[PDB]
Amino acid sequence: MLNRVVLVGRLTKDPEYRTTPSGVSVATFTLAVNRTFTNAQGEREADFINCVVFRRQADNVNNYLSKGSLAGVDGRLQSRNYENQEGRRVFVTEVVCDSVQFLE
Amino acid sequence: MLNRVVLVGRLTKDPEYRTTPSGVSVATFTLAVNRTFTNAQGEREADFINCVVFRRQADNVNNYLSKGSLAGVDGRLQSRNYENQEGRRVFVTEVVCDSVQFLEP
Prior knowledge:
The structure is a homodimer.
Chain A: E1 3-11, E2 16-19, E3 25-34, E4 46-54, H1 57-64, E5 70-83, E6 89-102
Parallel strand pairs in A: 4-6
Antiparallel strand pairs in A: 1-3, 1-5, 2-3, 3-4, 5-6
GO molecular function (chain B): single-stranded DNA binding
Subunit structure (chain B): Homotetramer.
Keywords (chain B): DNA damage, DNA recombination, DNA repair, DNA replication, DNA-binding
């Protein structure tokens, strides 16, 4: 079914490498996406969105992007959950990127 | 900055509609959005996305959608933090819907 997210934001930190539970390698980063609008009174505010990149694109991400870099992503929203090390069930929704555009 | 989400799925439950203490219609629901292709064994998978809608759109969602209804949403991906009753920080990601399209007649 139709599932599309497109964002432009700035990386909060340098990108990382991780593996998924089944051992598949990804790149990860979090985009700070400033709001186009403003909170009642003109105050600047962002959403912080976790992005995941599969296949060789992950290497492009980890080399071209760093903390503060502007990036665009086009992908699908995916949900999952897990139990953290304190035994707490954590729910996430992340953007699984079909492409990443390097804007600087 | 650019932040756009568009989904089509089916509600998992009836929507939760309420009017907040300061008079605002708000409705919540979770959209089950089937994935494109299937796992190793040909089994169907879905993503379960938490959606929120306000004001007139919320009123309409409450009037027309129920458990299992097919709907489309156009909105923005929003993050927030809260502290739960145990003092634990919970990170929340939800879609704030600008418009909801009712796909079943």
